[PDB]
Amino acid sequence: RFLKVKNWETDVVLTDTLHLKSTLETGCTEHICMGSIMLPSQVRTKDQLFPLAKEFLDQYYSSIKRFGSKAHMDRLEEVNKEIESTSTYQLKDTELIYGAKHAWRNASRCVGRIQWSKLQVFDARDCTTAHGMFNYICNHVKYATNKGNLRSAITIFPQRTDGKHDFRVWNSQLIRYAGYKQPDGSTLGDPANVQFTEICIQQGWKAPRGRFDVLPLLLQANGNDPELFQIPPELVLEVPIRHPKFDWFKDLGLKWYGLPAVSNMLLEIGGLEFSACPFSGWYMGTEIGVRDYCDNSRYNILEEVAKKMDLDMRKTSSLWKDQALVEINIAVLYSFQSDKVTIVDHHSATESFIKHMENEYRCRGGCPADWVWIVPPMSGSITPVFHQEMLNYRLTPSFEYQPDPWNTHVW
Amino acid sequence: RFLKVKNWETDVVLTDTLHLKSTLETGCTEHICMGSIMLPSQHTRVRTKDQLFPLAKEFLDQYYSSIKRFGSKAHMDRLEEVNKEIESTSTYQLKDTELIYGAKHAWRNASRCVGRIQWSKLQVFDARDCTTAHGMFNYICNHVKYATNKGNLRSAITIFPQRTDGKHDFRVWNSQLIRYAGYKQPDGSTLGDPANVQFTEICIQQGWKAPRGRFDVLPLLLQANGNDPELFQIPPELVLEVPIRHPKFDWFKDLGLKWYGLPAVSNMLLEIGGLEFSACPFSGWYMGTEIGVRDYCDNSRYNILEEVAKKMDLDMRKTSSLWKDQALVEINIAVLYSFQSDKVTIVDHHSATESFIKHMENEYRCRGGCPADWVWIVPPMSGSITPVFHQEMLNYRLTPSFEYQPDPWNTHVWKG
Numbered sequence: 125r126f127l128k129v130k131n132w133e134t135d136v137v138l139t140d141t142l143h144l145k146s147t148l149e150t151g152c153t154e155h156i157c158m159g160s161i162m163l164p165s166q167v168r169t170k171d172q173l174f175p176l177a178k179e180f181l182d183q184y185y186s187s188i189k190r191f192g193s194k195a196h197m198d199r200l201e202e203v204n205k206e207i208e209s210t211s212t213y214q215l216k217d218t219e220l221i222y223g224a225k226h227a228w229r230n231a232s233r234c235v236g237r238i239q240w241s242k243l244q245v246f247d248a249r250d251c252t253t254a255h256g257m258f259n260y261i262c263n264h265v266k267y268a269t270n271k272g273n274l275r276s277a278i279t280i281f282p283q284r285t286d287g288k289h290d291f292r293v294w295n296s297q298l299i300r301y302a303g304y305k306q307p308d309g310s311t312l313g314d315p316a317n318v319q320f321t322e323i324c325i326q327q328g329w330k331a332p333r334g335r336f337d338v339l340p341l342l343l344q345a346n347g348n349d350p351e352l353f354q355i356p357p358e359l360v361l362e363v364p365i366r367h368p369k370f371d372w373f374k375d376l377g378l379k380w381y382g383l384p385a386v387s388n389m390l391l392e393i394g395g396l397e398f399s400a401c402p403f404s405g406w407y408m409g410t411e412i413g414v415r416d417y418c419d420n421s422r423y424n425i426l427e428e429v430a431k432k433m434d435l436d437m438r439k440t441s442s443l444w445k446d447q448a449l450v451e452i453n454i455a456v457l458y459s460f461q462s463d464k465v466t467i468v469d470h471h472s473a474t475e476s477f478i479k480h481m482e483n484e485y486r487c488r489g490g491c492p493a494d495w496v497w498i499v500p501p502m503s504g505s506i507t508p509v510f511h512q513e514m515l516n517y518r519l520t521p522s523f524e525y526q527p528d529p530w531n532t533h534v535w
Numbered sequence: 536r537f538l539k540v541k542n543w544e545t546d547v548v549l550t551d552t553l554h555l556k557s558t559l560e561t562g563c564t565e566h567i568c569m570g571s572i573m574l575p576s577q578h579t580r581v582r583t584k585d586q587l588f589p590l591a592k593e594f595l596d597q598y599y600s601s602i603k604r605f606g607s608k609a610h611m612d613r614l615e616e617v618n619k620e621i622e623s624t625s626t627y628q629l630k631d632t633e634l635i636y637g638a639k640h641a642w643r644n645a646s647r648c649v650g651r652i653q654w655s656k657l658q659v660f661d662a663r664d665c666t667t668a669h670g671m672f673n674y675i676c677n678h679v680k681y682a683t684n685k686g687n688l689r690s691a692i693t694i695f696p697q698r699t700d701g702k703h704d705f706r707v708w709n710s711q712l713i714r715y716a717g718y719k720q721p722d723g724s725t726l727g728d729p730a731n732v733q734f735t736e737i738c739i740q741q742g743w744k745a746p747r748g749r750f751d752v753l754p755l756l757l758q759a760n761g762n763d764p765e766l767f768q769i770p771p772e773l774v775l776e777v778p779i780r781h782p783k784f785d786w787f788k789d790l791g792l793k794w795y796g797l798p799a800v801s802n803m804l805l806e807i808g809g810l811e812f813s814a815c816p817f818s819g820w821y822m823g824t825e826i827g828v829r830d831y832c833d834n835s836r837y838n839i840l841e842e843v844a845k846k847m848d849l850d851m852r853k854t855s856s857l858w859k860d861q862a863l864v865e866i867n868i869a870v871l872y873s874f875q876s877d878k879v880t881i882v883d884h885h886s887a888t889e890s891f892i893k894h895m896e897n898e899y900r901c902r903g904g905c906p907a908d909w910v911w912i913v914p915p916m917s918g919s920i921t922p923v924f925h926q927e928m929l930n931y932r933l934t935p936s937f938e939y940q941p942d943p944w945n946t947h948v949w950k951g
């Protein structure tokens with residue numbers, strides 16, 4: 125019940141007591157493990173809301189060494205009063221900042237959590253319109269990008285009330301490339317964004333129909349129809365992709381954007397639901413070079429790179445895919461580093477996470493971690509996280525998935 | 536109750552009902568996932584007549600179902616026979632056909648095994664009449680010769696007598712039938728395979744005269760009927776090895792690397808209808824990454840990345856040059872090239888994972904599911920350019936099964 129995790133490369137053994145504080149469910153049972161399911165299933169009556177608020181305030185006042193004190197009891201009483209009256213409540217600025225940093229700290233699928241405490245939280249709870257949302261998002265983008273010296277940030281729009289007045293960013297990321305289905309049946313640009321690229325066109329947008337067209341923002345305030353906004357191109361930092369050895373690499377015409385900024389998740393703090401809460405950090409190189417570039421359901425460039433490398437593509441056992449894969453990921457890192465845009469390779473990031481785990485076990489009693497997501501999509505076993513046992517459990521505050529708004533919106 | 540899994544690259548959705556026939560626990564709960572724990576409590580293995588007949592009945596029901604004889608007179612008589620044999624003798628014996636079925640289905644049920652497309656073509660050698668360590672040595676030699684087949688490898692398992700009172704166990708003390716020694720030097724470095732240092736020390740203590748090189752095949756340490764284990768040397772003409780060279784880099788051979796051809800796991804426990812076979816070596820053929828990624832490049836194994844990267848003259852100062860990833864690919868090319876050139880059976884990780892997906896889809900169609908452990912099925916390099924990376928997998932425990940068991944030197948009561 126006081127569980128232990130072993131690193132099989134170093135024999136370091138850590139003891140986990142934090143899991144006992146787990147609140148939500150994993151979708152596993154003792155008869156079946158669902159550890160590789162992408163998304164298991166896992167409005168609030170007045171009954172459900174106050175315990176959730178109590179739990180959150182308890183951990184907040186503990187964190188500032190004021191558990192069971194003056195201010196703690198008062199704030200519990202005050203929030204207790206507000207829920208009885210308004211059937212909801214509002215976080216003080218300090219509690220909102222704490223809740224957001226801890227949602228990141230608790231994200232068991234995130235390898236970059238050693239940075240969790242440096243998050244810049246932009247309070248946008250006074251926003252009322254999509255034009256105002258656009259303004260907050262431009263400021264976020266500019267602040268986070270910082271001319272290539274990327275800084276972590278989250279912007280938090282007003283919380284859900286009755287489900288009718290939801291704030292939503294319809295984009296999955298603030299910055300993503302368009303995808304178009306060609307007449308000849310193929311796909312131009314990013315195939316993952318074909319449907320969204322249509323809900324932009326088939327709703328107003330005017331597509332350049334290129335291979336790397338920055339999508340517009342589709343912003344929904346207070347439950348109204350969403351509105352199209354173009355991010356000022358001067359705010360969208362992009363990196364042309366070249367190789368430090370293959371001069372033909374530059375001729376491939378590849379680029380990527382510097383800022384990874386997830387915008388479709390739900391931030392839950394003390395029972396309150398923030399349905400629009402775009403957050404951003406900086407890339408790990410494999411996210412672009414392995415997944416974005418080489419997935420068969422994405423830009424899928426492996427064949428073309430290997431052909432330009434003149435590798436033997438007759439038999440899989442020549443490992444031509446693996447050879448091209450390494451080079452593509454050398455070029456991504458080389459290009460970001462050359463343009464002075466923050467990026468981390470998978471070796472450095474997983475080493476940081478092991479140190480972060482050791483820190484969290486030593487100072488917090490544990491660190492929930494999802495091995496299936498933490499281990500990078502290339503060279504898995506030469507990174508230290510491959511040999512690290514991890515316990516996965518759900519702590520709150522948390523980031524959660526939510527349905528795509530176009531399947532839900534009372535249009 | 537039905538359950539769905541999705542392949543996120545193809546959008547193929549499959550429906551699992553087989554998990555309903557699961558009994559053993561996983562280690563997970565509603566509040567914690569233990570999916571990345573190497574040996575959970577439930578995957579490891581002291582058994583009385585109390586719980587044995589229901590385990591036998593379940594196995595015999597499965598067996599007679601697969602042969603389309605469920606409820607037949609042969610089925611009912613066999614249940615009656617096993618029942619009376621249990622109450623009178625406290626255990627029972629499997630027929631040859633049941634043992635073959637059981638061993639094949641233990642492999643079929645091995646959720647961490649990516650090679651299960653081959654499960655129905657397993658050669659089962661019945662060594663239940665064995666009584667002495669020398670008899671074990673002879674059975675293992677025939678297994679190695681048959682399975683090796685001059686490079687054209689064949690899957691096989693040899694099954695020694697089942698456990699009785701746990702005081703007379705048959706055990707192969709080696710973790711694999713063929714493995715290289717490892718020696719800790721006084722300066723703290725290791726010669727050979729660091730994973731085998733502890734077992735190497737036991738062999739030396741038992742009287743093995745060690746050549747003390749980097750690729751010495753370990754002797755067999757064999758325990759019959761709960762007696763002290765005895766040392767045996769596999770005939771070298773039976774140990775097929777492959778010198779590792781690279782198809783473009785002529786300096787690669789000068790690294791002096793080789794590996795053996797036959798992967799043969801010898802420390803696991805085979806459970807069939809409540810019976811425990813503590814000595815059941817099994818063998819197949821290698822997937823290239825097992826050698827090229829894990830054996831050669833794990834920091835805690837031969838750990839050749841640096842010396843390989845040096846000879847390639849990559850930028851080794853910063854990790855963002857991916858010199859480690861670049862060396863890793865070339866080493867894995869060398870392993871596959873060497874085995875194929877010597878006509879020793881091997882499969883690369885692209886082929887093996889593709890076969891597994893086809894196997895898994897077929898198992899969902901004809902069996903209602905396929906228990907699979909993503910953490911183990913995804914290869915240790917180039918994960919997401921294989922199709923299993925994108926495959927949702929349900930992991931649950933079916934019997935018959937292979938289980939872990941403690942190392943015998945930790946439990947054995949020495950005779951002297």
Ligand code: HEM
Binds near residue numbers: 234277405411497523
């Ligand atoms: C600063 C550098 C960061 C790095 C290098 C990083 C890296 C990653 C990576 C590689 C993933 C895997 C997901 C995928 O492959 O698509 C991930 C997941 C995630 N990240 Fe981080 N991240 C960073 C910052 C942040 C920040 C600032 C937040 C929120 C404040 C965050 C929250 C999350 C969440 C919630 C997930 C998983 C979503 C899920 O549960 O499916 N990350 N991260």
Ligand code: HEM
Binds near residue numbers: 649820821825
């Ligand atoms: C025929 C070619 C085969 C291939 C390519 C293959 C491949 C693999 C691989 C790569 C693993 C992962 C384990 C590791 O990385 O150390 C594995 C696990 C396993 N294999 Fe197979 N295997 C084959 C045949 C067999 C046979 C014949 C059996 C038994 C009759 C078997 C039973 C198992 C079991 C029980 C495990 C799980 C070990 C555990 O639970 O920790 N395999 N296999």
Ligand SMILES: Cc1cc(N)nc(CCc2cc(CCN(C)C)cc(F)c2F)c1
Binds near residue numbers: 403406408
């Ligand atoms: C801030 C940040 C930094 C970084 N380096 N990478 C990312 C992308 C990670 C990410 C991806 C997804 C898509 C899930 N996929 C199955 C479609 C959802 C998320 F919530 C998430 F955080 C974000």
Ligand SMILES: Cc1cc(N)nc(CCc2cc(CCN(C)C)cc(F)c2F)c1
Binds near residue numbers: 817822825
């Ligand atoms: C027949 C066969 C074919 C193949 N290609 N590879 C293998 C080795 C895989 C393997 C490794 C282990 C050690 C686990 N670790 C804790 C050291 C245990 C096993 F039961 C197992 F099957 C076997």
Ligand SMILES: C[C@H](O)[C@H](O)[C@H]1CNc2nc(N)[nH]c(=O)c2N1
Binds near residue numbers: 497498924928
């Ligand atoms: C099916 C499987 O769960 C799916 O492919 C997961 C596997 N691991 C992952 N890991 C990361 N970091 N990102 C992903 O999108 C995925 N996808």
Ligand SMILES: C[C@H](O)[C@H](O)[C@H]1CNc2nc(N)[nH]c(=O)c2N1
Binds near residue numbers: 510911
């Ligand atoms: C901690 C983790 O469970 C452990 O390192 C596992 C990960 N996946 C693996 N997968 C395979 N095939 N073989 C292994 O030894 C491991 N080791």
Ligand SMILES: [Zn+2]
Binds near residue numbers: 152153156564567569
């Ligand atoms: Zn689980």
